[PDB]
Write a protein that binds this ligand. Sequence first.
Ligand SMILES: Nc1nc2c([nH]c(=O)n2[C@H]2C[C@H](O)[C@@H](COP(=O)(O)OP(=O)(O)OP(=O)(O)O)O2)c(=O)[nH]1
Ligand SMILES: [Mn+2]
Ligand SMILES: [Mn+2]
Ligand SMILES: [Mn+2]
Ligand SMILES: [Mn+2]
Ligand SMILES: [Mn+2]
Ligand code: NA
Ligand code: NA
Length: 310
Amino acid sequence: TLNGGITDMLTELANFEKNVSQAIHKYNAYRKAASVIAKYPHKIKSGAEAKKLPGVGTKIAEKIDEFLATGKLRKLEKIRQDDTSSSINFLTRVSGIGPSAARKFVDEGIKTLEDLRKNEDKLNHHQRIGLKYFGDFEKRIPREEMLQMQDIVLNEVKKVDSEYIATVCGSFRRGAESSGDMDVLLTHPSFTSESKLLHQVVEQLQKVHFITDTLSKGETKFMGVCQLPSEYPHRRIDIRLIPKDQYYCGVLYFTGSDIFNKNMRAHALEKGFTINEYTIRPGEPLPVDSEKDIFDYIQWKYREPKDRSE
DNA sequence: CCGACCGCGCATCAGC
DNA sequence: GCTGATGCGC
DNA sequence: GTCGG
Ligand SMILES: Nc1nc2c([nH]c(=O)n2[C@H]2C[C@H](O)[C@@H](COP(=O)(O)OP(=O)(O)OP(=O)(O)O)O2)c(=O)[nH]1
Ligand SMILES: [Mn+2]
Ligand SMILES: [Mn+2]
Ligand SMILES: [Mn+2]
Ligand SMILES: [Mn+2]
Ligand SMILES: [Mn+2]
Ligand code: NA
Ligand code: NA
């Protein structure tokens, strides 16, 4: 937490711009600043020192001056005290409720966790589940449960087909000691860039009562809720089915971080390449046989999953 | 000063 | 009933 | 909000 005070402040600003202002690029601006400062090896003594960093500019430096000076920020205090603002900010904590629905609930006087409970009729399936597990979803997941979870999924997959390969990605693959959720990258030989595979994995995981609820489900992505058997908290899980011959782009994507992916895909465009969770193109998909192969194509040195937490 | 700022899967519902 | 526009989230 | 064109 070298500069935690400042990165905490910037993260709150970001959240406000996203949820309340609905200014996604300001959100991204503040998270880049926060990200860049988070990897700064020195304790920031002024805004001027901070301003030297790319992503940090005039408006942020002045804010850092005020925070190092007054120990707080006036803009934030103002925002925390505004009813509409704080209300919207709070509702977005519910899975399925974004800036638009939050704002619209608040306009009709629905601003608390209780108000949503007495208005179930006005939530879609996804929001209801977000409300139902509101508390549980804000709880972190210890790697000890992640390992357990990893084992219940990998083995339930073998039990559908031995050629299925399930790889747990996300914060877990980065080596985090706790994770927001569980992300599973799934492949199988009968599915490539050339021509009910996920349904089968979802069904099986449902029968053994690991998957308790469904938020969204298509032919390549599943988002739902899972739970270790006996009571543990309910947890978020996402499964992504990726063409076997695109494992490495997929696993690079699904490993993150979200900020790292945005950094990498941008630097990609600099060097003349476009990256998605499937291919890296110039253009036709270039040949890839490892994650590193991707870091080569774009003249950025390789970095172990543990060193991708942007 | 202006304005671009990664890439994509699934669900909902206003407006026909 | 249908389907883009839009929303939400990875 | 930021930075590069
Ligand atoms: N291109 C792109 N990739 C993203 C974005 N957001 C995002 O999470 N990803 C990728 C990187 C993440 O590791 C992966 C899974 O998302 P996640 O919500 O489970 O986050 P996470 O595993 O890194 O962290 P955690 O909070 O669950 O512990 O999706 C985004 O906005 N753009
Ligand atoms: Mn995750
Ligand atoms: Mn996830
Ligand atoms: Mn401007
Ligand atoms: Mn459609
Ligand atoms: Mn996330
Ligand atoms: Na700067
Ligand atoms: Na939300």
